[PDB]
Amino acid sequence: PVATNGERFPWQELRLPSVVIPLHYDLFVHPNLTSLDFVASEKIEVLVSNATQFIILHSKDLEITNATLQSEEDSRYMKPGKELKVLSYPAHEQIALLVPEKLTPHLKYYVAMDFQAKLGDGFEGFYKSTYRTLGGETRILAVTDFEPTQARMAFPCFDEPLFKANFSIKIRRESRHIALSNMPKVKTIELEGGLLEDHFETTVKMSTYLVAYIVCDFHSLSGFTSSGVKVSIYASPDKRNQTHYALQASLKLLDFYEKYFDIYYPLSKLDLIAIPDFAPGAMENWGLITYRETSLLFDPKTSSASDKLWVTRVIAHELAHQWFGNLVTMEWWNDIWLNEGFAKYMELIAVNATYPELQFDDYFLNVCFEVITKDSLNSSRPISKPAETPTQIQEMFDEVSYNKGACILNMLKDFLGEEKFQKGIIQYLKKFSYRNAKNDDLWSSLSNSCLEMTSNMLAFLGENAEVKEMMTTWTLQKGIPLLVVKQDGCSLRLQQERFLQGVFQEDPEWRALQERYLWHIPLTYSTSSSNVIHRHILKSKTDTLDLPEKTSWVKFNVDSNGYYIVHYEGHGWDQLITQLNQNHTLLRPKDRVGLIHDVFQLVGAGRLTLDKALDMTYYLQHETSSPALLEGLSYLESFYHMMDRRNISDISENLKRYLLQYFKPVIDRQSWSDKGSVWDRMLRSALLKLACDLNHAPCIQKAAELFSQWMESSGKLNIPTDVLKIVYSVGAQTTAGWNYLLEQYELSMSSAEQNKILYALSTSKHQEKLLKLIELGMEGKVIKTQNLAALLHAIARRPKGQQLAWDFVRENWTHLLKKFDLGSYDIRMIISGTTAHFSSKDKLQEVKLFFESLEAQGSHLDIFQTVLETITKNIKWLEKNLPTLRTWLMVNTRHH
């Protein structure tokens, strides 16, 4: 309605008009890494579908100087063309190009624009990044990051994922720099002044948010896949030795993704570059995937086995995105899960297929449990929810769109079989190649999948209808269902419910939270007598089944492959617990993990008492399966840290004693080395970290001895990676070791070692030392600002830093909003990581007042409600179960 120069804007909708459709961008960028600014020009080929007097596109923080319109099909706009009037509307981040004469439909025009801006200083758009060399030199590079709505900060464009087009990129650079982009380099021309100009191959049809171009001086290692794709791993020169595994894994993973999807990677080259200053974990720019140094680089001397697993995960995630994201892109950000959820799920398939030795199949259950934590609350959301403003679009990248989408995909695969599910995937990818799809399109392609007139045809059409109907309820409804199972000789009564955390069965608002929710749950169950898996689809609120066997216990949801919680009435829980204590080996390992998880969730839900869960944790002395052991230990360790965060010293000390005593044999048999399998090493790390956290004398002595030897040798003696973080943390307890660790941090060349050292420094007791770490992170010179969100979290969870971090966030909010966006993942993680652990009425009131203060200033986020409800959850869990824990621990002291 208005503009910066007055006058009216010929558009209101924050969505661009569908009239002018782009076809081809000609993008020339001239960045100057000395003045830290860039000048650029573009020529967009547009197709006019309806007669209009104006074109609307996106532009943000770009000074536009020249704007012309040419046409080869409309003679009125012949060469050299006419000038266009530019109107700016920053409220919607749009600009309007006013044309002198109405354009003709079904024709093609060319929009040329010259613009310029400074290199950004944050994490978005075309921004500047620095790295440190081995000798101490500091170098500068320029990198792009556009997802979701930041491509408009680099060049004016139709910045929506539906407006796919081709891209011809040209970059002007000095001789000391190289230029990378999406496509390979076709030609380099030498300029008069001595500069160089790189011309890149034209890109295929793709959305704007995947455009990338980098000017740097990195070194790379190259390799070729089976299908001839040139994979190159780029990184800072002094770090080239850290890229070997990243190349090996990318090659293998790319070959698998081609074989599995039956579609070749279409570009001739694929580049993986490790950016020093990078906010997200990685970004899937087509042919130029940018990574954090901790997500791509692997150094055997300082990287643990878990680091190897994370690097493999992120490479598999980003490579899978090349199909689920670049090849087939969503229609709009409301269905963001169509990209992210699939990629998260494809991690499991790809890693487990290519690196089964990493045993990521056992770890996948955590992905679902993390969302169950947030889905059992009223403040959750459906996987497909509309979004409009850029902040809302950024908020769509949450655990819902990622993990929940991945988990229901795994549930649907278990229901349909791997062959049928794979065929549906291949049909979906081949059908929507180089275009966009939506939620309904995916479910149609997945249900109407052909493995490898008749009654088989009628059952095939009925079952495809069934599948589509089933998944529609899983994507359009929030929450997670709870299955109540009641046994009766041969009868089995099944009830479905909306599982709620911290809202019991009789609470006055529990019936107002059971409104219209109903799920088509594909139940699977096995019995104590027959190992045969039984399948049944629950389509109503209540149902009954019959199994002629009359057995002891019935275990529903085999391997927890279904997105639901099971509850057993009567003697069901007692039968299962007795089964575990006698011979846990009769139940499947994933069944044990699901049982432990579900038991503790129901204890919070009010369907079970805490002593029941604590009595189940008795069999953990007989457990050998690492996942189940680590699950129970994590619950007990969470209980200890929940007590220690408060001043409850008696319960905390009793929990420490029980953990050190009941789990002494497993702790003592652990070595201080990097030997064994992946889960063997991860079990060692977790157990030794737990023991050293509880001030166990042998752990502390061994860690102090290792740290003393390492410091006296000055890096010459080697600490095992699996124990590296533990040793450094213990060493940081002394001012001498603390300062030495900070100095080694500044001088280190391994990002993994730096991450371990930073954690170690955060485990200090002195208030001034933690505050200095926070201030260093804010400054961004020694400790990079990209680590701030993580650092604050590590400090706030500990008792000494809880109030310090909370005070810092409340006081320096305005300074934080200058470094990150409101909807950015960093701000969301800062708020949650400093507030969600609170479990008192006073802290809940403080957080409520803080969020209200953030309101009325223009800042609103969904994480506000989620944090509040979680703090409320914690308060209710304490008041309802605190004396029970006390009594159980005291009873254990007397039971011997």
Ligand SMILES: COc1ccc(C[C@@H](C(=O)NO)n2cc(CNS(=O)(=O)c3ccc(-c4ccccn4)s3)nn2)cc1
């Ligand atoms: C497993 O390895 C991973 C996991 C996630 C990612 C994120 C990445 C992506 O997945 N791209 O496809 N991404 C999203 C955006 C834009 N939105 S953002 O608000 O700025 C935001 C940034 C990070 C988020 C996040 C991180 C962890 C969990 C949930 N969310 S959310 N840019 N890059 C990369 C690799």
Ligand code: NA
């Ligand atoms: Na994506």
Ligand SMILES: [Zn+2]
């Ligand atoms: Zn992703």
